[PDB]
Amino acid sequence: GLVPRGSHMASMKHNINDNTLEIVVGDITKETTNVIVNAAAGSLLGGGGVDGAIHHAAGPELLKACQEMRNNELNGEELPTGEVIITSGFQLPSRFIIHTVGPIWNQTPDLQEELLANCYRNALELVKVKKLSSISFPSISTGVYGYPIHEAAAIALQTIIQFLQENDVGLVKVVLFSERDYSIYQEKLKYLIEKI
């Protein structure tokens, strides 16, 4: 699966308002939060990484749902960078998948930080208004799309943290299949908490 066998397991939890932010090493396709987030492609065709794993786990109905959403909600266009759509999770233990498109590193350097942050803000706004109680995010735009992990992780955490300071959402997880990524997130979060 996404988490290499024998990876170090680890968790960190912190409350913000009556919200909770959790960082964990894990396989996001096995998360039991109400929502998980897919780091998708504009095409909403499944690829590799988290996107591939989510489609494999969710089953074939996901691709079909996504392409009709593209046809109906998006009028046949790709999902724009930073925007979101929601579908069923199908065979996933999570009820819903929010699909978002992260910026591809340095394609639009002037905009990309705001666009990556939009992924987070739009997903949380959706959770808020639909009262979905819990959501798991993966690392978005990172990889060999990739976005340097320290920079991506700063944008994610700061955006999530401010949103949780200002809103009732519930439980937000960042679920990472890499203990390397987790360690960066853990230390950065502790650093950001200290500032609040």
Residue numbers in the entry: -10 to 185
Sentences from the paper on this structure:
Macrodomains are ubiquitous and evolutionarily conserved modules (approx. 130–190 residues) that recognize ADPr derivatives in their free form or linked to proteins, including ADPr, PAR, ADP-ribose-1″phosphate and O-acetyl-ADPr (OAADPr). To expand our knowledge concerning the field of macrodomains, we have characterized Oceanobacillus iheyensis macrodomain (OiMacroD), the first to be described from the order Bacillales. A yield of 40 mg of pure protein per litre of culture after a simple two-step purification process was obtained. The subunit has a mixed α/β fold, similar to that of other nucleotide-binding proteins, composed of a central seven-stranded mixed β-sheet (β1–β2–β7–β6–β3–β5–β4) and five α-helices.
To gain insight into the structural and catalytic role of residues N30 and D40, the corresponding alanine mutants were constructed, instead of more conservative mutants, with the aim of completely abolishing the catalytic activity. Surprisingly, these mutants were active towards OAADPr. In addition, two different conformations (open and closed) are evident in the β6–α4 loop (residues 131–135). Interestingly, both alternative conformations of the β6–α4 loop are visible in the same subunit of the N30A mutant, representing a snapshot of the complete conformational cycle of this loop. The best WT and G37V crystals were grown in 0.2 M ammonium sulphate, 0.1 M MES pH 6.5 and 30% (w/v) PEGMME 5 K. D40A and N30A mutant crystals were grown in 0.2 M magnesium formate with 20% (w/v) PEG3350 or 20% (w/v) PEG1500 with 20% glycerol, respectively. G37V and N30A mutants showed cubic (I23) and orthorhombic (P212121) space groups, respectively, with 1 subunit per a.u.
